[PDB]
């Protein structure tokens, strides 16, 4: 019986770990996307404050 | 002189001293009545039993909780139990300390009316106080500033909170809680053979939610799992062997509290009326509420109920604001924690309402002021 | 015999989601903070674009 | 093709054909196995004898009933009763015949897909569907709207329904039924003297109950008057001779539905039930659940049920419905006439569960969707 | 031809056809949808039911206003509703009449634009033309200056006339109305032990309000003559028995109009928004405007409104200027007895938008010319 609930603990443990491990893969995949959207702004601005400069320069 | 402070839940009593860690006295909230005939002449037959007395001889009474959702509908039997929390669990006599009890918000004006009658005429308690649930909570959380989502046995509410400041408009209370969870569960049980129907084997089923259960973090794919594989199912032996084994029960019995129309009901979980407990506050003070939601009460402690909130607020709200779930190790007694803080208090102790301004106003001062 | 095979199982199970929880806490921390100066260069480029705006309505 | 209805209960099967206005056969759901030893050689010993012809050689028989509480609970002899249903008592070929089985609710799961399971392996059904009482009774009372209460051989429940939508967590099983109360009247027969112990003669108790068995109005001063005159004595003629006479049994034996306490039951009786699974029920929709009480089922049969029912249901009630207890003469056969009228419709044709579902889809195909 | 008058509103339906006295159906504006299973095969149950067919099968549906707050957050069901109004209530062909439509004051843009996209292409009506809800009501009263307060069930609203002509800056748009007292009250009624949660259960105190309440004439010193005597409870009996009584929410509930701080709103009482709308506009104009101060809408229609209304505005005032509260008795039908008058004017047949003219200018030739 106390190998029962060794045992007993083990398995909330594991349930547990495994349960914010899904979590934080959702997590992590999550920051990758928006990593992706973060460079796709940066980029848009680039272009954005770019053509005004060329505007500015020109005149 | 030291204060009592008894918050009393409709599934558990917890009695103790303003000052202390943690609750001395905690015992089930019920009080049972025995039904067969009794033959042996001399064995000292008791009329009643209340606490966790009535938990042991179980098997032979029939048990009746004297608080159905958060409203006491048995006086006497609530008299009972108040009278057996002061004399036989605390051992200390009444007339000699301050009581520092606790209601939740949006019962009826009796209940507070009677509480107090009682206390200052069967008890004559020096002075008293009837504090809110989820006040004390943010006390012990540590916090001034958060909503907190408070569920016990018969009532689940929450109750923003901004520097100290009520937003009494705001408050959402919901008639869902462990007992109607245990009832689900009782129910759902049957669909597997497994058939529970005395109020005793109600307090077995309510051992195995309590042992058992967890909230899926996703439910549908969840349920999808259990169906294919058979790694889900945990077994239970009840107090006679016999053992069984539950499958998808695990997590369709907590479930409930997202999907309310499982037993009927038209509400919504508790993560949508905590987001529209939210948008119904000022929009300054919004930011700060959805990081500082505060889980409390024997309720939500389910495995992963913390996960799934999150989740669920996290869709619901904005994809800027940062939502934050503090659902501490601790959080079944932060009531009571959060109530012994209080009565601690220096600056609390010209708030007690003391018998004599009972003896001049009648019960009704008690939400005349305090 | 099964109760020492199982508790050998979970305890293994335990230490490698132990380091995946780790190594995933990290590496999610630190996209993260990427995705923090990403936010921040977002300001900076809207800004100067706003400046840039500012030029071209004046001249 | 015409379509087979065999509503199978817990102690009386009744099959027929849909379209019909009365089961074509009525046996008792029984299967008998020899136990004395066999003595005359060449007399062409049968191994085990089902429905009513195990009933006349029951003098040499041990009775057992497959059906317990509802659940299917020996599934072999389960499978012998539906043969000889089929070939000996309705003689048809179950190869060309969907086949409306029927079912209580709240019972496992394993009970609907092991009927189903059983159908189409060893008989064959082109198509079959699993109804539930209470919603053909409900069609054979000509109603949409009425909380049903119905009392066989092993269960009672109530099911609210309201312009045809079911309120399934209102449903109340509960699982004293005829078989309850003949144990219970075969325990007080002897303290008059008489001593029946055997299944035959539960046979023949069961027939006692069914012949001078009736519901007192007012279970008090009934008691009283039958210990004050001899008015109340009838008496009965056993198989042999042997006239006893029987006095308060015959009401003490079905009051036991209003008082499941005499059997050691923690539940309540039959009228508070049903009021509770009314009380339930939406606000709006309880006024017309009290006027439309339909009684169905054998157990609800006895004499002065209506009006002991009417009169529990109206105390516990506000003082302003009308309580109308609808109690069909006929009532005995309400799921089996509700059934045949439901395989009748012509909307229905789509529902049955065809062959080629369940060769896709396994058993669970059963309540799965349908 | 004739045309047809369509106030919508936020609680009622009002329609019917432009000439007559009053509206030839009023129905409330709600979509009902079954919650629960549906068992009776063949009972053709419909997907949706509206108006008050939706308030008779309460029990079973959950209902839904397609209207918020004057603005329409629900297109496919106000499309229904428009449906609903026009085929099964009015039995008429949208093909062959003009229809005036009515909206408030100080509402997005995007509201008109749909509603007339709608009109114009899902009912092909020949013209429409989207009036404003004060002015209609002025026309009713028989007026051309004043400032009439319009209260509803989603807006209250104040638009000051002078001779004909609107002072757009002087509109004061306020956001309580008959469904915030609703609300309301279905808060303070728990204090008494009464719980309504249910959206059924929400008409149900909806009726209560509509029955009971009404506006004390001196907040303070009712308060304590409730609490006094016991003079002023009465008695509503819920549609199942269950009789209730209330005390001071009767004029707890309406007072929230002139407190708006009661459910946590920021804004002044109607009275006082009244008297700064009316200080707004050029100081020769306001002493006409002193005398004719209109009411309108379904929530001025408790007892003792126009009482307190005209005592509040005169201590606000001048104490010279003759206050003076116009208050029909069928002014719960100002708007579309207005609506009538006007679509019946000979000189108003120019301002109709045809159809032609939308399909030139698109949906947005609404607010560029009408
Ligand atoms: N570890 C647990 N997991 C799930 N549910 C629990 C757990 N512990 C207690 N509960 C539920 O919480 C309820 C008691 O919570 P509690 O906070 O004491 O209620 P109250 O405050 O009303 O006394 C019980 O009904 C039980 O079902
Ligand atoms: N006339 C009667 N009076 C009282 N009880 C009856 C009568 N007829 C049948 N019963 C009871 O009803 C039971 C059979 O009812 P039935 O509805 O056939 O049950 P099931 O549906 O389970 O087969 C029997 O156990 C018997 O005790
Ligand atoms: N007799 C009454 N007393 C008090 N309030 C009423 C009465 N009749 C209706 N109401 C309130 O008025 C509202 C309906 O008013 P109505 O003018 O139809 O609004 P709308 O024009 O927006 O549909 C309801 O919500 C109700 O609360």
Same mark, same amino acid.
């Given at each position: 019986?106390?190998?029962?609930?060794?045992?007993?603990?083990?398995?909330?443990?594991?349930?547990?770990?495994?349960?914010?491990?899904?979590?934080?893969?959702?997590?992590?995949?999550? &920051?990758?996307?928006?990593?992706?959207?973060?460079?796709? #702004?940066? +980029?848009?601005?680039?272009?954005?404050?770019?053509?005004?400069? !060329?505007?500015?320069?020109?005149? | 002189?030291?204060? =009592?402070?008894?918050?009393?839940?409709?599934?558990?009593?917890?009695?103790?001293?303003?000052?202390?860690?943690?609750?001395?006295? @905690?015992?089930?909230?019920?009080?049972?009545?025995?039904?067969?005939?009794?033959?042996?002449?001399?064995?000292?037959?008791?009329?009643?039993?209340?606490?966790?007395?009535?938990?042991?001889?179980?098997?032979?009474?029939?048990?009746?909780?004297?608080?159905?959702?958060?409203?006491?509908?048995?006086?006497?039997?609530?008299?009972?139990?108040?009278?057996?929390?002061?004399?036989?669990? !605390?051992?200390?006599?009444?007339?000699?300390?301050?009581?520092?009890?606790?209601?939740?918000?949006?019962?009826?004006?009796?209940?507070?009316?009677?509480?107090?009658?009682?206390?200052?005429?069967?008890?004559? @308690?020096?002075?008293?106080?009837?504090?809110?649930?989820?006040?004390?909570?943010?006390?012990? /959380?540590?916090?001034?500033?958060?909503?907190? %989502?408070?569920?016990?046995?018969?009532?689940?509410?929450? @109750?923003?909170?901004?520097?100290?400041? $009520? =937003?009494?408009? &705001?408050?959402?209370? =919901?008639?869902? &809680?462990?007992?109607?969870?245990? +009832?689900? %569960?009782?129910?759902?049980?049957?669909?597997?053979?497994? /058939?529970?129907?005395?109020?005793?084997?109600?307090?077995?089923?309510?051992?195995?939610?309590?042992?058992?259960?967890?909230?899926?973090? +996703?439910?549908?794919?969840?349920? $999808?799992?259990?169906?294919? #594989?058979?790694?889900?199912?945990?077994?239970?032996?009840?107090? +006679?062997?016999?053992?069984?084994?539950?499958?998808?029960?695990?997590?369709?019995?907590?479930?409930? %509290?997202?999907?309310?129309?499982?037993?009927?009901?038209?509400?919504?979980?508790?993560?949508?009326?905590?987001?529209?407990?939210?948008?119904?506050?000022?929009?300054?003070?919004?930011?700060?509420?959805? &990081?500082?939601? @505060?889980?409390?009460?024997?309720?939500?402690?389910?495995?992963?109920?913390?996960?799934?909130?999150?989740?669920?607020?996290?869709?619901?709200?904005?994809?800027?604001?940062?939502?934050?779930?503090? $659902?501490?190790?601790?959080?079944?007694? #932060?009531?009571?924690?959060?109530?012994?803080?209080? $009565?601690?208090? #220096?600056?609390?102790?010209?708030?007690?309402?003391?018998?004599?301004?009972?003896?001049?106003?009648?019960? /009704?001062?008690?939400?005349?002021?305090?």
């Amino acid at each position: 019986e106390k190998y029962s609930q060794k045992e007993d603990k083990y398995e909330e443990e594991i349930k547990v770990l495994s349960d914010k491990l899904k979590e934080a893969e959702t997590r992590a995949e999550f &920051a990758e996307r928006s990593v992706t959207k973060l460079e796709k #702004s940066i +980029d848009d601005l680039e272009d954005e404050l770019y053509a005004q400069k !060329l505007k500015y320069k020109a005149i | 002189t030291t204060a =009592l402070v008894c918050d009393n839940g409709s599934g558990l009593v917890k009695a103790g001293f303003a000052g202390d860690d943690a609750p001395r006295a @905690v015992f089930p909230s019920i009080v049972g009545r025995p039904r067969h005939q009794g033959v042996m002449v001399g064995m000292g037959q008791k009329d009643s039993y209340v606490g966790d007395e009535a938990q042991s001889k179980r098997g032979i009474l029939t048990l009746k909780y004297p608080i159905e959702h958060g409203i006491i509908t048995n006086w006497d039997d609530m008299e009972k139990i108040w009278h057996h929390t002061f004399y036989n669990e !605390l051992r200390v006599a009444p007339e000699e300390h301050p009581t520092l009890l606790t209601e939740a918000p949006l019962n009826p004006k009796a209940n507070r009316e009677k509480m107090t009658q009682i206390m200052f005429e069967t008890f004559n @308690v020096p002075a008293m106080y009837v504090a809110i649930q989820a006040v004390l909570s943010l006390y012990a /959380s540590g916090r001034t500033t958060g909503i907190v %989502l408070d569920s016990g046995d018969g009532v689940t509410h929450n @109750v923003p909170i901004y520097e100290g400041y $009520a =937003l009494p408009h &705001a408050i959402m209370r =919901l008639d869902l &809680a462990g007992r109607d969870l245990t +009832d689900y %569960l009782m129910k759902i049980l049957t669909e597997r053979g497994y /058939s529970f129907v005395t109020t005793a084997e109600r307090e077995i089923v309510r051992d195995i939610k309590e042992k058992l259960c967890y909230v899926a973090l +996703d439910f549908e794919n969840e349920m $999808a799992t259990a169906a294919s #594989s058979s790694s889900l199912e945990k077994s239970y032996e009840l107090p +006679d062997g016999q053992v069984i084994t539950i499958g998808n029960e695990r997590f369709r019995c907590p479930e409930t %509290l997202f999907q309310p129309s499982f037993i009927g009901m038209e509400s919504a979980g508790i993560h949508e009326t905590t987001y529209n407990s939210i948008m119904k506050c000022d929009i300054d003070i919004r930011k700060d509420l959805y &990081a500082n939601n @505060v889980l409390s009460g024997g309720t939500t402690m389910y495995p992963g109920i913390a996960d799934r909130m999150q989740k669920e607020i996290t869709a619901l709200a904005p994809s800027t604001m940062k939502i934050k779930i503090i $659902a501490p190790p601790e959080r079944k007694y #932060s009531v009571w924690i959060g109530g012994s803080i209080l $009565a601690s208090l #220096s600056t609390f102790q010209q708030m007690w309402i003391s018998k004599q301004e009972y003896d001049e106003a009648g019960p /009704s001062i008690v939400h005349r002021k305090c």
